[PDB]
mmCIF file of C-alpha atoms and ligand atoms in Angstrom:
data_model
loop_
_atom_site.group_PDB
_atom_site.id
_atom_site.type_symbol
_atom_site.label_atom_id
_atom_site.label_comp_id
_atom_site.label_asym_id
_atom_site.label_seq_id
_atom_site.Cartn_x
_atom_site.Cartn_y
_atom_site.Cartn_z
ATOM 1 C CA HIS A 1 11.848 -6.977 3.903
ATOM 2 C CA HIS A 2 12.235 -4.218 6.538
ATOM 3 C CA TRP A 3 15.132 -2.237 5.092
ATOM 4 C CA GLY A 4 15.358 1.516 5.759
ATOM 5 C CA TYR A 5 17.725 4.330 6.682
ATOM 6 C CA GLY A 6 17.439 4.053 10.458
ATOM 7 C CA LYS A 7 19.895 3.048 13.108
ATOM 8 C CA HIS A 8 19.405 -0.747 12.659
ATOM 9 C CA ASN A 9 18.129 -1.328 9.076
ATOM 10 C CA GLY A 10 20.143 1.266 7.107
ATOM 11 C CA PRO A 11 22.398 0.863 4.070
ATOM 12 C CA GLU A 12 25.210 -0.928 5.985
ATOM 13 C CA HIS A 13 22.714 -3.796 6.696
ATOM 14 C CA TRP A 14 21.130 -4.156 3.176
ATOM 15 C CA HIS A 15 23.645 -6.746 1.976
ATOM 16 C CA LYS A 16 22.183 -9.395 4.337
ATOM 17 C CA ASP A 17 18.810 -9.566 2.486
ATOM 18 C CA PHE A 18 20.232 -8.255 -0.876
ATOM 19 C CA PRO A 19 23.707 -9.646 -1.480
ATOM 20 C CA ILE A 20 24.035 -7.748 -4.786
ATOM 21 C CA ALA A 21 24.590 -4.788 -2.429
ATOM 22 C CA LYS A 22 28.313 -5.714 -2.610
ATOM 23 C CA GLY A 23 28.295 -6.325 -6.371
ATOM 24 C CA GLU A 24 30.357 -4.929 -9.220
ATOM 25 C CA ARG A 25 28.085 -2.117 -10.487
ATOM 26 C CA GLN A 26 26.495 -0.579 -7.441
ATOM 27 C CA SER A 27 25.304 3.013 -7.120
ATOM 28 C CA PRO A 28 25.737 5.786 -6.113
ATOM 29 C CA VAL A 29 29.401 6.637 -6.655
ATOM 30 C CA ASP A 30 31.725 9.559 -6.084
ATOM 31 C CA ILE A 31 32.312 11.396 -9.333
ATOM 32 C CA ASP A 32 36.002 12.374 -9.439
ATOM 33 C CA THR A 33 35.866 15.317 -11.877
ATOM 34 C CA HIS A 34 39.537 15.118 -12.768
ATOM 35 C CA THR A 35 39.420 11.417 -13.835
ATOM 36 C CA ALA A 36 36.123 11.541 -15.863
ATOM 37 C CA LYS A 37 36.983 11.858 -19.549
ATOM 38 C CA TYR A 38 35.127 13.774 -22.215
ATOM 39 C CA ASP A 39 33.612 11.212 -24.614
ATOM 40 C CA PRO A 40 33.136 12.404 -28.270
ATOM 41 C CA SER A 41 31.113 9.256 -28.925
ATOM 42 C CA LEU A 42 28.182 10.535 -26.879
ATOM 43 C CA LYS A 43 25.200 11.488 -29.141
ATOM 44 C CA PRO A 44 23.135 14.613 -28.208
ATOM 45 C CA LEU A 45 20.876 14.031 -25.113
ATOM 46 C CA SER A 46 17.167 14.523 -25.740
ATOM 47 C CA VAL A 47 14.859 15.162 -22.786
ATOM 48 C CA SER A 48 11.380 15.141 -24.374
ATOM 49 C CA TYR A 49 8.775 15.902 -21.721
ATOM 50 C CA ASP A 50 6.264 18.078 -23.699
ATOM 51 C CA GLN A 51 3.521 15.462 -23.393
ATOM 52 C CA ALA A 52 4.275 14.295 -19.812
ATOM 53 C CA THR A 53 1.174 13.189 -17.869
ATOM 54 C CA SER A 54 1.606 13.012 -14.072
ATOM 55 C CA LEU A 55 -1.082 11.098 -12.148
ATOM 56 C CA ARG A 56 -0.363 10.688 -8.463
ATOM 57 C CA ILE A 57 2.059 11.339 -5.589
ATOM 58 C CA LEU A 58 2.675 8.545 -3.042
ATOM 59 C CA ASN A 59 4.563 8.346 0.216
ATOM 60 C CA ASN A 60 6.084 4.863 0.009
ATOM 61 C CA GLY A 61 7.778 4.966 3.439
ATOM 62 C CA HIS A 62 11.268 5.648 2.050
ATOM 63 C CA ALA A 63 10.584 8.639 -0.209
ATOM 64 C CA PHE A 64 7.675 10.018 -2.254
ATOM 65 C CA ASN A 65 7.194 9.188 -5.901
ATOM 66 C CA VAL A 66 5.467 11.371 -8.480
ATOM 67 C CA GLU A 67 4.026 8.788 -10.858
ATOM 68 C CA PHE A 68 3.480 9.247 -14.596
ATOM 69 C CA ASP A 69 1.345 7.614 -17.257
ATOM 70 C CA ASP A 70 3.822 5.388 -19.076
ATOM 71 C CA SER A 71 1.243 3.468 -21.159
ATOM 72 C CA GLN A 72 2.568 5.224 -24.311
ATOM 73 C CA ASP A 73 5.661 7.270 -25.342
ATOM 74 C CA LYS A 74 4.580 10.620 -23.782
ATOM 75 C CA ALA A 75 7.648 11.664 -21.792
ATOM 76 C CA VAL A 76 10.881 10.029 -23.004
ATOM 77 C CA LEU A 77 14.638 10.262 -22.676
ATOM 78 C CA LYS A 78 16.818 9.440 -25.712
ATOM 79 C CA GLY A 79 20.297 10.109 -27.029
ATOM 80 C CA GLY A 80 23.463 10.616 -24.997
ATOM 81 C CA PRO A 81 24.699 7.202 -23.879
ATOM 82 C CA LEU A 82 21.330 5.602 -24.612
ATOM 83 C CA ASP A 83 20.248 3.347 -27.443
ATOM 84 C CA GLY A 84 16.540 3.537 -28.175
ATOM 85 C CA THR A 85 13.779 5.098 -26.154
ATOM 86 C CA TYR A 86 13.292 5.292 -22.406
ATOM 87 C CA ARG A 87 9.926 6.102 -20.926
ATOM 88 C CA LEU A 88 9.480 8.268 -17.782
ATOM 89 C CA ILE A 89 7.695 6.305 -14.974
ATOM 90 C CA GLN A 90 8.354 8.324 -11.779
ATOM 91 C CA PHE A 91 10.540 10.836 -10.072
ATOM 92 C CA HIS A 92 11.583 11.032 -6.422
ATOM 93 C CA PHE A 93 14.180 12.708 -4.205
ATOM 94 C CA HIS A 94 16.794 11.835 -1.585
ATOM 95 C CA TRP A 95 17.560 14.470 1.077
ATOM 96 C CA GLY A 96 19.258 15.024 4.360
ATOM 97 C CA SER A 97 18.562 16.231 7.894
ATOM 98 C CA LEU A 98 20.740 19.289 7.208
ATOM 99 C CA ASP A 99 21.995 20.990 4.033
ATOM 100 C CA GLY A 100 25.498 19.422 4.194
ATOM 101 C CA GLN A 101 24.237 15.999 3.260
ATOM 102 C CA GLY A 102 21.430 14.350 1.331
ATOM 103 C CA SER A 103 22.684 13.588 -2.169
ATOM 104 C CA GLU A 104 23.583 10.013 -3.175
ATOM 105 C CA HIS A 105 26.160 10.861 -5.831
ATOM 106 C CA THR A 106 29.003 13.134 -4.668
ATOM 107 C CA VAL A 107 31.257 15.356 -6.822
ATOM 108 C CA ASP A 108 34.875 15.291 -5.651
ATOM 109 C CA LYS A 109 33.467 14.054 -2.322
ATOM 110 C CA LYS A 110 31.068 17.026 -2.095
ATOM 111 C CA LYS A 111 27.615 16.072 -0.847
ATOM 112 C CA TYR A 112 24.655 18.195 -2.010
ATOM 113 C CA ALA A 113 21.532 18.856 0.153
ATOM 114 C CA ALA A 114 19.379 16.633 -2.065
ATOM 115 C CA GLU A 115 19.203 14.659 -5.293
ATOM 116 C CA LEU A 116 16.284 14.270 -7.718
ATOM 117 C CA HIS A 117 15.997 11.048 -9.707
ATOM 118 C CA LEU A 118 13.845 10.831 -12.885
ATOM 119 C CA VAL A 119 13.439 7.168 -13.606
ATOM 120 C CA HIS A 120 12.913 5.859 -17.158
ATOM 121 C CA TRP A 121 12.573 2.316 -18.618
ATOM 122 C CA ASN A 122 13.774 0.911 -21.958
ATOM 123 C CA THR A 123 10.716 0.426 -24.163
ATOM 124 C CA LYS A 124 12.373 -2.472 -25.995
ATOM 125 C CA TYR A 125 11.585 -4.584 -22.838
ATOM 126 C CA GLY A 126 7.840 -3.811 -22.830
ATOM 127 C CA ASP A 127 7.339 -3.125 -19.154
ATOM 128 C CA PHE A 128 9.271 -1.824 -16.181
ATOM 129 C CA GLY A 129 9.373 -5.174 -14.411
ATOM 130 C CA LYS A 130 11.146 -6.845 -17.395
ATOM 131 C CA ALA A 131 13.404 -3.814 -17.929
ATOM 132 C CA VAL A 132 14.893 -3.980 -14.341
ATOM 133 C CA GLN A 133 16.138 -7.523 -15.137
ATOM 134 C CA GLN A 134 18.379 -6.176 -17.963
ATOM 135 C CA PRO A 135 21.729 -4.327 -17.788
ATOM 136 C CA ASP A 136 20.414 -1.602 -20.170
ATOM 137 C CA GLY A 137 16.907 -1.600 -18.665
ATOM 138 C CA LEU A 138 16.718 1.790 -16.947
ATOM 139 C CA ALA A 139 18.011 5.334 -17.453
ATOM 140 C CA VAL A 140 17.970 7.581 -14.376
ATOM 141 C CA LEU A 141 18.536 11.328 -14.773
ATOM 142 C CA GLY A 142 20.038 12.627 -11.501
ATOM 143 C CA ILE A 143 19.940 16.322 -10.584
ATOM 144 C CA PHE A 144 21.703 17.808 -7.515
ATOM 145 C CA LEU A 145 19.862 20.292 -5.312
ATOM 146 C CA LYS A 146 21.517 23.058 -3.307
ATOM 147 C CA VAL A 147 19.821 25.433 -0.874
ATOM 148 C CA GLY A 148 19.666 28.991 -2.085
ATOM 149 C CA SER A 149 16.797 30.573 -4.019
ATOM 150 C CA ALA A 150 13.386 28.940 -4.343
ATOM 151 C CA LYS A 151 12.586 26.698 -7.311
ATOM 152 C CA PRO A 152 9.268 27.903 -8.677
ATOM 153 C CA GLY A 153 8.643 24.612 -10.497
ATOM 154 C CA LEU A 154 9.023 22.612 -7.259
ATOM 155 C CA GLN A 155 6.442 24.487 -5.261
ATOM 156 C CA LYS A 156 3.472 22.363 -6.478
ATOM 157 C CA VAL A 157 5.238 19.337 -4.975
ATOM 158 C CA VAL A 158 6.053 21.154 -1.704
ATOM 159 C CA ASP A 159 2.474 22.190 -1.199
ATOM 160 C CA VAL A 160 1.027 18.694 -1.575
ATOM 161 C CA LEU A 161 3.418 17.024 0.996
ATOM 162 C CA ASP A 162 1.199 17.918 3.970
ATOM 163 C CA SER A 163 -1.464 15.658 2.406
ATOM 164 C CA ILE A 164 0.856 12.585 2.140
ATOM 165 C CA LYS A 165 2.676 12.832 5.445
ATOM 166 C CA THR A 166 2.723 9.113 6.265
ATOM 167 C CA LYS A 167 3.560 5.801 4.535
ATOM 168 C CA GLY A 168 0.852 4.608 2.251
ATOM 169 C CA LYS A 169 -0.842 7.975 1.742
ATOM 170 C CA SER A 170 -1.320 9.210 -1.804
ATOM 171 C CA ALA A 171 -2.845 12.209 -3.500
ATOM 172 C CA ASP A 172 -3.986 12.963 -7.022
ATOM 173 C CA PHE A 173 -1.218 14.917 -8.838
ATOM 174 C CA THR A 174 -2.128 15.759 -12.383
ATOM 175 C CA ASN A 175 -0.797 18.302 -14.789
ATOM 176 C CA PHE A 176 2.676 18.566 -13.178
ATOM 177 C CA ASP A 177 5.441 19.608 -15.608
ATOM 178 C CA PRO A 178 8.819 17.943 -14.870
ATOM 179 C CA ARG A 179 10.631 20.380 -17.202
ATOM 180 C CA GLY A 180 10.317 22.882 -14.327
ATOM 181 C CA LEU A 181 12.860 20.885 -12.272
ATOM 182 C CA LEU A 182 15.727 20.976 -14.884
ATOM 183 C CA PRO A 183 18.763 23.262 -14.642
ATOM 184 C CA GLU A 184 19.718 25.512 -17.571
ATOM 185 C CA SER A 185 22.506 23.216 -18.841
ATOM 186 C CA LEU A 186 22.191 19.518 -19.594
ATOM 187 C CA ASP A 187 25.941 18.771 -19.401
ATOM 188 C CA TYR A 188 26.349 15.414 -17.662
ATOM 189 C CA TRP A 189 28.447 12.497 -16.446
ATOM 190 C CA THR A 190 27.403 8.953 -17.224
ATOM 191 C CA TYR A 191 28.323 5.506 -15.915
ATOM 192 C CA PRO A 192 26.672 2.026 -15.546
ATOM 193 C CA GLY A 193 25.242 1.318 -12.141
ATOM 194 C CA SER A 194 22.282 0.224 -10.125
ATOM 195 C CA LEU A 195 19.126 1.152 -8.297
ATOM 196 C CA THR A 196 20.145 2.879 -4.996
ATOM 197 C CA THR A 197 17.396 1.191 -2.947
ATOM 198 C CA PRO A 198 16.559 -2.504 -2.535
ATOM 199 C CA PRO A 199 16.428 -4.691 -4.503
ATOM 200 C CA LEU A 200 19.554 -2.767 -5.841
ATOM 201 C CA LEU A 201 19.320 -4.233 -9.332
ATOM 202 C CA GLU A 202 22.193 -3.590 -11.701
ATOM 203 C CA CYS A 203 20.150 -2.253 -14.560
ATOM 204 C CA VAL A 204 20.787 1.509 -14.662
ATOM 205 C CA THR A 205 22.516 3.898 -17.070
ATOM 206 C CA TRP A 206 23.143 6.910 -14.840
ATOM 207 C CA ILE A 207 23.093 10.363 -16.375
ATOM 208 C CA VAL A 208 24.052 12.862 -13.631
ATOM 209 C CA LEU A 209 23.776 16.541 -14.495
ATOM 210 C CA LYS A 210 26.737 18.742 -13.603
ATOM 211 C CA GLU A 211 24.631 21.860 -12.866
ATOM 212 C CA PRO A 212 22.636 21.759 -9.642
ATOM 213 C CA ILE A 213 19.258 23.380 -9.179
ATOM 214 C CA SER A 214 18.629 25.776 -6.268
ATOM 215 C CA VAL A 215 15.746 25.251 -3.798
ATOM 216 C CA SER A 216 14.895 27.408 -0.777
ATOM 217 C CA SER A 217 15.410 26.512 2.861
ATOM 218 C CA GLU A 218 11.588 26.764 3.304
ATOM 219 C CA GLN A 219 11.107 24.238 0.499
ATOM 220 C CA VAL A 220 13.519 21.701 1.903
ATOM 221 C CA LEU A 221 12.188 22.162 5.433
ATOM 222 C CA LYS A 222 8.788 20.951 4.130
ATOM 223 C CA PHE A 223 10.428 17.739 2.752
ATOM 224 C CA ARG A 224 11.850 17.144 6.236
ATOM 225 C CA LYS A 225 8.331 17.183 7.761
ATOM 226 C CA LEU A 226 7.369 13.945 5.996
ATOM 227 C CA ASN A 227 7.307 10.699 7.956
ATOM 228 C CA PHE A 228 8.736 7.222 7.270
ATOM 229 C CA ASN A 229 6.042 5.772 9.511
ATOM 230 C CA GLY A 230 2.385 4.956 8.848
ATOM 231 C CA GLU A 231 -0.510 6.978 10.244
ATOM 232 C CA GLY A 232 -0.781 6.851 14.038
ATOM 233 C CA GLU A 233 2.612 5.186 14.568
ATOM 234 C CA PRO A 234 5.502 6.760 16.461
ATOM 235 C CA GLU A 235 6.770 9.664 14.339
ATOM 236 C CA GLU A 236 10.031 9.175 12.496
ATOM 237 C CA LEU A 237 10.925 12.143 10.319
ATOM 238 C CA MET A 238 11.700 11.276 6.694
ATOM 239 C CA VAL A 239 15.297 12.496 6.569
ATOM 240 C CA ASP A 240 18.661 11.045 5.462
ATOM 241 C CA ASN A 241 17.070 8.744 2.911
ATOM 242 C CA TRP A 242 20.328 8.495 0.926
ATOM 243 C CA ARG A 243 22.689 5.598 0.289
ATOM 244 C CA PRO A 244 26.376 6.512 0.561
ATOM 245 C CA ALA A 245 28.861 6.224 -2.294
ATOM 246 C CA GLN A 246 29.858 2.660 -3.378
ATOM 247 C CA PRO A 247 33.068 1.314 -4.886
ATOM 248 C CA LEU A 248 33.623 2.252 -8.513
ATOM 249 C CA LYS A 249 35.412 -1.092 -9.208
ATOM 250 C CA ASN A 250 36.336 -1.385 -12.954
ATOM 251 C CA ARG A 251 34.004 1.359 -14.178
ATOM 252 C CA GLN A 252 34.739 4.553 -16.067
ATOM 253 C CA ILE A 253 32.751 7.763 -15.695
ATOM 254 C CA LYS A 254 32.402 9.672 -18.956
ATOM 255 C CA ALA A 255 31.731 13.403 -19.381
ATOM 256 C CA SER A 256 29.468 14.880 -22.090
ATOM 257 C CA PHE A 257 31.350 18.210 -22.053
ATOM 258 C CA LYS A 258 34.905 19.047 -23.093
HETATM 259 ZN ZN1 ZN B 1 16.624 7.555 -6.111
#
């Protein structure tokens, strides 16, 4: 597959190789704040990252992933809409060419400059590859980024990007603390959806935080220096790696906050 975000292989084309692209639980979606209902059923959300062990950062030609050791229950997400325990496997971002676009989810049609996704798999399925085949297989924590003040906790990522400029490059990336990327409040919206890149599997419980984090213009300019291409190939800046909002269809978005 040769899917991307370019002029001729971008999201509007994905359905040809991945027909689930036009399915009933696709992501991202617009979050209409006036129609999302507070849900008293939601249990407290527990983001338990004290023991998180990062290993590596990789430019995969469509974003970069910070990868974690998920061989035991070290960094987990529980509670909220979730049943059981979800293990952190990687985080990545989606961002734009300019600050007025870049997020995948939108809030009353507002696009943010970027969106961070912390991806977790349901331990009841044993491994990630089994979990993505199940409707309750993954939990993705999405966090909006706006451009303002610098995020101290992001700077360790920013400073390694120069070393992974092109597709296929990786760098060691140990002792990174993902708690440094959280906003102050964990109020959220939740709905059932999908992976936002091919193969677009419909296996995700989305938990999208209402409070964005702030990053500096200098920080996001360094993201926009990455390349989609491999070493020595014609340079294509890694920008606008976001899928646009998809039809909500029958689904309800629930709010954790009154
Ligand atoms: Zn993502």
